[PDB]
């Protein structure tokens, strides 16, 4: 049985028969769309022999499938290999290749991300020998190293140990490897990212000597084999900042604003042939919007729109002036400008979902289909004036995937 | 089973126990989520066998007798009854004019893709069921126009003309919307006035219309009745309330000769009400600003008209990292709800129709049990996430009665 959609700008279809390769759940049923829940129950992440062996089975097909080596005697072999390790020790080990082929296809399958053109040139690094928080440290300051490569950002993820009873985890406590404190004054305003503000506190109370100011590098929280996390500050010639500055507003470099390069996700779990790598930050380059939109002006982030607008002298007296609108755009504006001067990396919203566009015409060609939430794919910003907005999609749950899981604090068993 | 739904600005989770009630279906199942499907099977409308007309009868029945406090009343079993009696002779049935209005109102409370519904109790329901031709027709189109534009303080209406019978008795109007600018191919390929209706252009010129061939011609009414051929009508301009589009700031705006009618009135969908048909039902209420900037204006495949609007800004149109379509686009949809507010025809803005959309989702599961909810429609084409709708969960069933699509007439008539 195939599938069509249909982009409402062009007229072209294409058929999905991709979709028949899913396994998990998208939480939707015949009678109730669950397509703008943040987080359903079947994204979000113990596990036993029962259900073990037919997910490497699945994943070790695909993986010989994508050599041109399937039902070969190198495929039976490992499976029996696969086979013989789990019922021997209740879980089984990647190989290299495996284990690369599998960060990717995560990636390739993350239904939420506009930026999966580039999913085939993600550097991995494998760091499953491990086995200390300081271990820990010493391979994510390589990787921001690696990533960031002065300015001329490259996609890469670091994977740590698997899990294996559930009480030895590796963990990541930030959300991600670089972001900026957030304190809630006793006046009830804030400092900061709000964003960050629970974090910020566990640190401050694990030991972290904070220095109250609006843009603070967060110290790493890194937790290895189950045991208490430690805390590391990244050396900060390692972490590359850009300061925001506006091509016609001269005052706008005054708001005393900057940003991080380098966006690392460093809190989901990623899962391949049902093995759980609960920690494996990953890294890209940013789209222009995630912060000069989202965080720099939504109402729950740094919220700055009120004063880039107050700068500007736009009619704030009334909505329908559209000055949130106006502001807006001069913020985004800023920010890519400010990148692009200082060379780092970055890509505008229209280049971006351009090239999400081309990205997914082509996996329909040649893979079948290309799972994709439009909820997410869309831009938070002109919307309409962007290819994506008028593209019908598909979405469905592949594996290998990345997952959200719970916040290791709500979880963790503290050994003093 | 008593499904949440959380705001992410506000942390505000609202109890969804209205979509147990749900009847029709998402195109969705559990292994693909289609949320952005245009138009799933489910949203489009060919007998109604005697069978599942009563059931479907009895539903809306119940849901309208609870509504007024009188289920399982004296009254209630009497209609049940009655409404059996008839559909048992007749194979169909006729609402009486409360029930209609019920109908109508809840028709629209229920669409799950329309932000503007805080409003859905006020509609004003014109019962057109004894209608027979289109020139009746065109006098009930002309008096719900009149009434619906009340010289710019616009009300909400929908004109119910008589329901479907067998198929071959149908009511449409051809338009999609009552008022709708026309679009000419142009010899050397370009594009004269609105794209979208292009091919509705030459129905309107190949079975009888003489063009003006400007840029913002009214295009002349379609109507059909009892199955017939249409007939085309012009409607009295005086009563096309149209405003011309200038800028508070930018003086040069005006001379881009643009304007846009007042009146959103759409024509062309099917009013499903306790199995009953109803294939031609005009609504009209009032313009939220961006569907006019942002989608008729400055998308591609309509009026398109970002590059010119850029230029006489002179922008950097060099890169797309200027960003010049975005403050370009940002200064259209200031100029058109500046336009609507300076000659007092209603409009409301995003930010203020968005709220009022969250609020209205407050009052629904309040006293409702619920709201159904299409994010996919309801976040507004710009500055979605500076609006409140971008950082909320909504939940999307079908509820009936409903308003739900039908194929274009003339790919179907028997002609
Ligand atoms: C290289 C440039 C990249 C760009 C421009 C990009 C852009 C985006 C954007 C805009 C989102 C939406 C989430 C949000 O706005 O908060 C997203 C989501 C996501 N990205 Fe990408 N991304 C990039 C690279 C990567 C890489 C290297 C990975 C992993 C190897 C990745 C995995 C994901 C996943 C899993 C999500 C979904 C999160 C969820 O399900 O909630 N992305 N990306
Ligand atoms: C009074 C102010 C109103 C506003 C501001 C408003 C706004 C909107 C908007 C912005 C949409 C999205 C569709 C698009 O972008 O083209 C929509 C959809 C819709 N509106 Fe409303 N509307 C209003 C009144 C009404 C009335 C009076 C009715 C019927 C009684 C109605 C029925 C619908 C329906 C059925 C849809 C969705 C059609 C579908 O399912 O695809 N609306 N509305
Ligand atoms: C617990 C609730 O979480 C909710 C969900 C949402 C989480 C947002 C989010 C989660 C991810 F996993 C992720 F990958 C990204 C993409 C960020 C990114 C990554 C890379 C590599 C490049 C790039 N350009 N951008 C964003 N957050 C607002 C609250
Ligand atoms: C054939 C292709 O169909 C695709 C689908 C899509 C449907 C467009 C559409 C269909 C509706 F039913 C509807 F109600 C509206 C809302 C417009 C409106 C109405 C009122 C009363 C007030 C107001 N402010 N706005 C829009 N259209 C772009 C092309
Ligand atoms: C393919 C996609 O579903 C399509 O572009 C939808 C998206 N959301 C929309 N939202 C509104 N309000 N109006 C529309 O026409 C659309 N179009
Ligand atoms: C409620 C809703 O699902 C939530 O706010 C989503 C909407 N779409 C999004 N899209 C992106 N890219 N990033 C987000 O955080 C969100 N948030
Ligand atoms: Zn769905």
New interface residues.
Partial sequence: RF?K??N??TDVVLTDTL?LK?TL??????????????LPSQHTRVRTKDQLFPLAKEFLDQYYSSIKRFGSKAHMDRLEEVNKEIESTSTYQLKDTELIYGAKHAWRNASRCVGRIQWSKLQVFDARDCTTAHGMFNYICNHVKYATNKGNLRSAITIFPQRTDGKHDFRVWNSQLIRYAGYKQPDGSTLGDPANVQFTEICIQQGWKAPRGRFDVLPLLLQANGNDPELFQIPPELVLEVPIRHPKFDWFKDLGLKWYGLPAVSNMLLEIGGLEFSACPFSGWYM?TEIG??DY????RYNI?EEVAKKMDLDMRK????W???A??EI??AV?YSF?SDKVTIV?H??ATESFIKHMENEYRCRGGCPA???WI????????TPV?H??????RLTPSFEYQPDPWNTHVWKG
């Fill in positions: 599938l959609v249909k409402w700008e979709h899913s759940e998208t939480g939707c049923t015949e009678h109730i769309c669950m397509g703008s829940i943040m222009g939109v989202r002006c939504d109402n729950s729109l909505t329908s002036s559209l949130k609108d106006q807006l755009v985004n504006i890519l692009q505008d229209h280049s939430d439009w909820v869309v831009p938070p910003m002109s919307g309409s004036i907005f593209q019908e999609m598909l979405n469905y």
